Nucleic acid binder design. Structure first.
Ligand SMILES: Nc1ncnc2c1ncn2[C@H]1C[C@H](O)[C@@H](COP(=O)(O)OP(=O)(O)OP(=O)(O)O)O1
Ligand SMILES: [Ca+2]
Ligand SMILES: [Mn+2]
Length: 430
DNA sequence: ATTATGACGCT
DNA sequence: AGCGTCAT
């Protein structure tokens, strides 16, 4: 009852860019705007692999991981932009730099956690509390929430989608008790007002549109964000959780999309997040471990405590390349040349990072894959990163991997390498 | 031949 | 530390 925590202490948003790499290319090339288009990497194998898809192209069935040649079968007029190639490999610098544009704007509003190249969590609890004082018990107009959906509404008492959106927003606002400065629903609503402002600023200052979720924690904010893409934001209230979760496949919740989620389904014989409420915390801990069990027990009730971490910059800087099928590296000269290519991109990015962010990486992580293994990595080894020098880093990487070679012979490499990976880690202030 | 990343958990 | 999971 009165002592039962409800996980309504925070206001958390998740802001996620719409079809991000496509928008970056569409800003650069106006011919691609408002078209079915996709971003591809490489080209010689089946037209290249698609990594981002405009909403116009999605209507034709084009998806990520599709070969461009195959996408063209669904959408003959599909336009394509290619990822830059430098030193023989895909280079994602344009998108990392566009990401910084967005992250720096968001940081003006609140402390953010960079969750990916195109999304960040926002802890808005303090900002909400300041805005609530400014409001002075003044009601929140629908005009302040022009792109907001209230999940679960309208209910009860309608043809167009925008009209449905407004109907739900009106029901929500009509029911709001603005007299209580500690009402969680009011706090979320003010959070949503701030996120409208944030999203408007991002679009004004970069050209990029985004979606967002507003709720009481990161998992609900993430889930909310996807409910009404693109270019819209969604408020998921604590009260909306029982209905929302009653038909929500377990795999849709962040961290449950893989083996753990499959195990929850198999072991408990359930399908939807809401069905988890019928198990005790100890029951869930017995199957999934102490940490997962407690997390699931609270999460299926809409409660999660994971903080928005104050971190805007990536913790690592890495450079990776696959060498599939017959392109696998089978000579020592090959392995050395590609280690150098990777190290040269790594040095470039490291040197810029040191100048921009007043830090230095101290550990180099080297990872490879061998033909036949179908784990991501076959072997991971670290060594010291003492100088930002590509020839040194590539020599050091070779040194830590070189006994991998089963080939008796000097020059040959067996089994051939199908992936190389260099990663700079363990930053210290500088 | 679903690539190039990047965070965090386990032991 | 080196490996695995999950994610975009
Ligand atoms: N599996 C991947 N491999 C390589 N790049 C990826 C992969 N997934 C995502 N990206 C890149 C390209 C995306 O534009 C960008 C952001 O990913 P993501 O948020 O999942 O989709 P998206 O921004 O392209 O569309 P959406 O509007 O659905 O969010 O990160
Ligand atoms: Ca996105
Ligand atoms: Mn994303």
């Amino acid at each position: 009852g009165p002592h039962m925590a409800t996980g309504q202490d925070r206001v958390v948003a998740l802001v996620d860019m719409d079809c991000f790499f496509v928008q970056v290319e569409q800003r650069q090339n106006p011919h691609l705007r408002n078209k079915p288009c996709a971003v591809v990497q490489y080209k010689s194998w089946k037209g290249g692999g698609i990594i981002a898809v405009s909403y116009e192209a999605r209507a034709f069935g084009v998806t990520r991981s599709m070969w461009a040649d195959d996408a063209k079968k669904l959408c003959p007029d599909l336009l394509l932009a290619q990822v830059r190639e430098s030193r023989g490999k895909a280079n994602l610098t344009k998108y990392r730099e566009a990401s910084v544009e967005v992250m720096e704007i968001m940081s003006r509003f609140a402390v953010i956690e960079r969750a990916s190249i195109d999304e960040a969590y926002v802890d808005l609890t303090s900002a909400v509390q300041e805005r609530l004082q400014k409001l002075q018990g003044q009601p929140i107009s629908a005009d302040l929430l022009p792109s907001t959906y209230i999940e679960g509404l309208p209910q009860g008492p309608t043809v167009q989608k925008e009209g449905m959106r407004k109907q739900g927003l009106f029901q929500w606002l009509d029911s709001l008790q603005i007299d209580n400065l500690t009402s969680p629903d009011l706090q979320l609503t003010v959070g949503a007002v701030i996120v409208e402002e944030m999203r408007a600023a991002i679009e004004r200052e970069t050209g990029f549109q985004c979606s967002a979720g507003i709720s009481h924690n990161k998992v609900l904010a993430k889930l909310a964000c996807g409910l009404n893409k693109p270019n819209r934001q969604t408020l998921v209230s604590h009260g909306s959780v029982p209905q929302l979760f009653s038909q929500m496949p377990i795999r849709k919740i962040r961290s449950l999309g893989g083996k753990l989620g499959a195990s929850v389904i198999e072991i408990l014989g359930i399908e939807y997040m809401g069905e988890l409420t019928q198990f005790t915390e100890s029951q869930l801990q017995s199957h999934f471990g102490e940490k997962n069990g407690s997390w699931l027990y609270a999460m299926c009730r809409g409660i999660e405590h994971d903080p928005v971490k104050p971190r805007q910059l990536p913790k690592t800087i890495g450079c990776s390349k696959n060498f599939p099928g017959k392109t696998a590296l089978a000579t020592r000269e090959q392995v050395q040349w590609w280690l150098l290519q990777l190290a040269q991109e790594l040095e470039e990015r490291l040197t810029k990072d040191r100048n921009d962010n007043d830090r230095v990486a101290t550990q180099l992580v080297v990872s490879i894959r061998v033909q036949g293994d179908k784990r991501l990595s076959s072997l991971r080894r670290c060594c010291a990163l003492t100088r930002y020098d590509a020839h040194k880093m590539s020599h050091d990487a070779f040194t830590v991997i070189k006994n991998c070679n089963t080939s008796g012979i000097q020059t040959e490499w067996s089994p051939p390498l199908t992936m190389l990976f260099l990663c700079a880690t363990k930053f210290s202030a500088s």
